[PDB]
């Protein structure tokens, strides 16, 4: 029927009303350290945001004035034309050739019906034009993401090699912390034998009254040197372990920020590409929906002119249009349009 | 599938939750509260201003279409039935129908204006909800920053506890050497004294040297025993303190994971609220153009304007009727 | 050899292989889990949506050609068997033929548009399949990365075990020297102290040097006996620790070989799926062009369109009658 | 015959789509250090994916619109319109000179078959034109890979010499670790002798106290020197062996990465050369398939102008164009083109 181009023209526009929100909700965080690409990819988001602004409060609501509202507006008069002709059937169902006044009255009322459906297709024309030039603005705010300062071709590869760089740094710092543990055990052994050799040296110096003070002073001096070496090595290695874990924290939150950036950029790119790919089908099927009502207006024009020429009132029942067999289909079409709202 | 109850449920969830701090509150937390309560400004400004307006715009369009519109259609219907052969705009009866037609199409213009103003009243509230979503999801990255920072802190405390346990093992194995030092020192001290007494002091230098390394070994092993035992107590206290810090910051991880789950739930709620506002604006501009239709039903013809406009009036009234009672 | 059964079997093979982490859970196994669950999302998006799409496109092409096409061919076969001579555009019989043919060739338009849109609905899925393939391979090279790393870890622990065994043999040789140092030392100590007590009345420090070198020999031999014995026990504990590391690394390498075989089976299934996908697009373009043939059939003549177009519709529809029962 | 060239041109293009899938399978992994040839042969891969991606989405399936669907659309009429003239033979089986409307209609049905066959070979021209531009773009992507910074003539050779470098460095490092094992044995006997003569020298110094104390302090001094020298030699050699096995890890991972890159570049070269050595046969035999329908177009059009001007109705059966054994071959053609599906 004609209902399945109405539902298809409404569905491909509700897809855009949904996915403009997917573009507009995409808003990534300012990082700790700000990269090079961050500013000149932000404005190309805002241009891709503001035109989606023109789909959330201006054109998104207005595309519902086109597809359900013009069909129910046409059927509001198409529920009135049939009874107005069916009442005048009882007066003169034989009057032909533009003779009786009521036949010419019904003729100019169906001419007003043709002007009403011409206004229907004019409303759909205005809505399709306001869809199309916004589509040029949204596509112009889209294709800059794929031509210059691209999110995919440059920054996805850049943030992937940045995530790999931070993973490499994390691996190097963890192997470094392993080696510093293996050196810290040596520092503790050195300060232990330093304690022992220092007290043994000064004890052999005192306990022999300095008769062997050369070798005992040597033992005490190597003990004090081992104390100092183990102590400052322990302090230095613990400072390097703490600074290595601070570096692990820094590049770990850097890798987290880069993952949060790539998911937002992939969402923005996929939403904008699907918005363009569905705006194409939306404009095409709205063009078919506009020409459907335009050729139906021309068909009603041909019926009006052939009714002005010579057509009998029973020849209108010989026609398909003003009977019950088409208004019964379009009652289901407006029931579908009430399902679509 | 009623898209007003969906926004009712989402704003109920947004007005519902109020997230609690962790044990130590960071620098952004109250600011995250300052990115929540502004949303707690709008979700009541929906349900105490625009929630009342969506429950007060429909009794203006069901009651004034129950009494005024039905009789005002019946009047022009009976004016059709009184003379179905009339013509002309300067007719008496066509004038009597045209005054009521222009009056009804002029008094639906005010309710048209308030419905078209309701579009603007929902528009700015929708963009404000979008902005309050984007500021809250802007603040909700510091939670992941502090979570991954405290995860690094947990890894650092695990490394330090492993280091201190290896130090406990090595200091036990060296404390054995300090005890062996005082043992062999006490033995060779009494060996030097007994060898000096037994040889009547003739083995003076040898047993004096044995006793000298004996005393040096007992006081050196004693000081090394005291220092290594004190160090073992110190890094047992360090193991206890770093295990306590690991449990405490792990508790902070669960607290901030609950906070991040709450903030993710609230921003997903506004994420769905934007699509449900899109569908409600779809239905609302359908109703606004339905009343635009009733205003463009001011069109008056020349001959018998009654059946050419008033059945369209009643049919658009019925299309408003079924949808507004679905919104009731 | 049925191409759709091949791809549904391969997608269910992607669904039933999840892979297990090794003992030390690395820093990339969460990323490999992300690559697998994205490939699972692609395989389940094909199984849950495009799967029933292929199985629901065919009864829509059978049922509409069961009765709706056959009533059309029966009607415009009656119009040719009863009146094969009528011509001219305003003729009533060719008007009936053009009415039922602009009914059929424009009621097939939605079904043709669906079957034509499924070409792009397959193409974006093939793009997502080759997308989920390559990041999975870039994650699965890290398998043999750590496999090579644990292989040289095995080599390092084997070299260190051989080093500790050579050190154990040399220390078990040097213990004999420390023990003969204690023996010769206690012999020279008792000889030197006997030599000093036998020379008490005069002086003999020549006798007092033998006992000094004997006492230093027992002290030095005892200290290195203790140190070399504790180093032997330390080297046995090091052989035990390195053999434990070698056993656990050999245990981890076969888990990594299993994970490598899992990622290899998944990428092999994706490759045969992406080839049989092109073999399915091979016939999907055939059915797309076959429903484009009805667009070629919509061009109607003026003079007895039955003998011009209707058996063409019957022959192409019978080719679709072959194909749609070949797809089930 | 008239079907086996269609099957041969289809066997020519399934080879193209299979080796194009072999091109799309080729994606080599990023190494730890990205060499000189990478950053170009990334995009010289990647662009040689994108034009190859044109075969994957549409154009490969669109050359599968040329052969196996046009035979169906051709015997939509050729299995049809032979039996239309068989009922026209019932009225006038010999009437010539354009006297009847039946002969004038059997003429225009053959002109309709002429326009249908011309539309078939025009669809074949469109699909072979798309194959022509895809084939020259595939040659355009093959040229810069196989000539400018050649993957096989340069980087296969440079990677083989890099593998030889890593092999010689691995054997060098394992010889160094064997030498370091022997030097470790010497350092262990150094510290083992040094502890003995240290404590022997200190016990001799504390016992003797003469010039024997001077030579005993010498013994203890060379003992402490041997302890410190053997100890730092032991520690330095364990440090060197651990760093050297980390070097063995680095070189073995580099050798495995290089073997993976060589296998990927061998697969790329085999796939792209098998594409380019078959795409010219694909265009040549699809041009053969187009000129087969062009020969069929003139071989129908001469029958058409003879049937218009001076043919009988038995003479249509007499010619082999409208014959039935050849039409049995042209039902075998449809069964073959459906077997190719």
Numbering used by the authors:
A (entry chain B), D (entry chain D): 10 to 350
B (entry chain A), C (entry chain C): 19 to 346
Reproduce passages from the article.
Using Caenorhabditis elegans and Danio rerio (zebrafish) as host models for bacterial predatory interactions and infection in aqueous environments, respectively, we obtained evidence for a new V. cholerae cytotoxin denoted MakA (motility-associated killing factor A). The crystal structure of MakA revealed that it belongs to the ClyA α-PFT family, named after the potent, one-component, PFT ClyA which is expressed from a monocistronic operon in Escherichia coli. Our recent studies of the proteins encoded by the mak genes in V. cholerae demonstrated that MakA can form a tripartite cytolytic complex with MakB and MakE, whereas neither of the three proteins displays cytolytic activity on their own. Within acidified organelle lumens or when incubated with cells in acidic media, MakA forms oligomers and remodels membranes into high-curvature tubes leading to loss of membrane integrity.
We used helical reconstruction to solve the cryo-EM structure of a MakA filament assembled in vitro in the presence of ECLE liposomes at pH 6.5 and high protein concentrations. One repeating element of the right-handed spiral consists of 37 tetramers that complete five turns around the helical axis, spanning a length of 216.5 Å and a diameter of 322 Å. This arrangement results in an axial rise of 5.85 Å per subunit and a helical twist of 48.65°. Application of these initially calculated values with local searches in a 3D refinement further optimized symmetry parameters and resulted in a cryo-EM map at an overall resolution of 3.7 Å. The building blocks of this filament are formed by two MakA dimers that organize into a pinecone-like architecture, spiraling around a central cavity. From the top view along the filament axis, the helix features a propeller-like structure with a weak, annular density embedded in-between the blades formed by MakA. This density resembles lipid tails and contains some spherical features, which could be associated with phospholipid heads, suggesting the presence of a thin phospholipid bilayer that spirals around the central cavity of the filament. Interestingly, the annular density is located between the TMHs of MakA, indicating that the active toxin form interacts with lipid vesicles and starts to oligomerize by internalizing membrane lipids. Interestingly, despite certain similarities, all four copies of MakA adopt different conformations within the tetramer, as indicated by MakA-1 to MakA-4. In MakA-2 and MakA-4, this region superimposes well with the crystal structure, whereas helix α6 of MakA-1 and MakA-3 moves by almost 10 Å to extend the length of α5.
